[model samples]
Target: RTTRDDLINGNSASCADVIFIYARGSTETGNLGTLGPSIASNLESAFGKDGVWIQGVGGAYRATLGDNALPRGTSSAAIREMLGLFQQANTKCPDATLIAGGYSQGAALAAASIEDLDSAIRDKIAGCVLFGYTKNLQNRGRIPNYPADRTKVFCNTGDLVCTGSLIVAAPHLAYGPDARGPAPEFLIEKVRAVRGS
Candidate 1:
């Protein structure tokens, strides 16, 4: 039996006002990145402790030989896992809002999942926030197009992952401070709009 408790990562809570699914960058823990924590903190501040915050896992492989790269399939699997949580939440709490966010490869995962979400589930989502998205993969159509009004992409000015220009990794490491302030505010606004609050 797939109970509601089985869908989430941590201990089960009775209810939630919002569900926040956050994916970490490559080789990072579910809650490793600044973007994931900061946004979660903000949501908790506004909506109380009952709001669900889940960190997506998988995507931990390091490539070595030919075609050495993170597997898209792994990321897609993570996406499916998160989507299952959303579906379960909808059945458990029809009024709860949903938000998806991620950093680096995690961001790519969120983007890919959004494209495949069922329309009913998509309608429940308030917004998505992606940090340090890979530009090359997005160009190749790995990351599907999301509604402009409901999604926020935060690529630093010189982030090589999103810009395809700089080879250095400095910009990719700069999203914590940049996203901490605005991302939460954006999420709050979207939630309010979706709930008509």
Candidate 2:
């Protein structure tokens, strides 16, 4: 619920234990969903009952909703904005463990945000649960250097969105599973195990 500007400007009062940076596809659709109800559903699904969700980087929304044709390289800017949010969250919750979770571009943003964190802080990241990502031709960023060995990633072959652009190498956090029914319960269990909840 905080503006990227306010976060970067050092607004620590609204910071949470975990900062969920949603993905911005094409400079449009600030968030996949803007209404309170939609946001609430995602929050409850991602963090369960005790956690809070805050929107980061709102202006990415372009001329209108449901549009994906962004100008160009806006993705990098969104990543920067996410990095700023992480800085703000760290300031408020030094011991807080950031958990980045998203679908497509949101997952990318989450992965990139972890890369953007400082060595000391980044090492403290609890884990990441990325859905709808693929492991085809895309190069997965090197997170082996992360201090924690619990980083995780998952994708679905049936998730049409899992294209070559999101793939990574072996030992990567990426995993492609058949999306038959109920969101691949095994992966869900792995995610919870990573969070140690």
Candidate 3:
């Protein structure tokens, strides 16, 4: 997922209190540079001084692909990155809670990351919000590592990309309207609920 230009020109932002792990969609993952400004704006609004957005961070396709698939190491990599960020945050805001948010493929990556986290760190994760995509939650048999209690998946009913076999794999997990506009908040609520907030 690390392309030449991204390495050269990519900007990294780390706030003293918050560490935001922003997963890039396929285009951004491919280094096509298609990340939306509104997404960054929303994240800034969410955490303000505590936020640390990890742009072009994790690539889902590299982790898992196709039907009944699970990413081998992508989830682990995400967990490690978040853990590192949490350590950094502790130095600034020792009591700060960890929050992770992502969109589309990034959302999927975030969910995968949660499953791989250590129990203590996983408990510390306030919530994990996924926008514009759904997972095969019901088919826990297919995704043995998914954290049903700690992870929440959100996708719009009308979202075309959410159709096909992905829904069949996660019959009960998919929630909310299609991924269009202002749907990310719905996802955040769902994530909060998962955290029992």
Q: Write the per-residue lDDT of candidate 1 for residues 35-125, one digit (tens) a residue.
A: 5666666777888766554444333322111211345423445667656656766776676788877777667667766677787887787
Question: After aligning candidate 1 to the native by TM-score, how far in Å is the CA of 62 from where it should be?
Answer: 10
How do all models score by TM-score? 0.77, 0.55, 0.52
Native RMSD of candidate 2 (Å): 7.5
Candidate 2, residue 194: the lDDT equals 54
lDDT of 2 by residue, 1-197 (tens): 31323234434554444444444332324454322224334545666534544444454323232221232212566666667666666777674555444444555555666666787766655554455443212535223344334444455444443455322333232232322222323333434565566
lDDT of 3 by residue, 5-64 (tens): 222232334333333444544334342123333444454565452333333453323423
The alpha-carbon lDDT assigned to residue 170 of candidate 2 equals 39
Show where candidate 3 strays beyond 4 Å. Answer: 1-15, 29-36, 46-94, 134-152, 158-197
Which pairs of residues collide in model 2?
Answer: 1-54, 1-55, 23-106, 27-60, 27-62, 28-62, 135-167, 136-167
Residue 37, candidate 1: alpha-carbon lDDT: 65
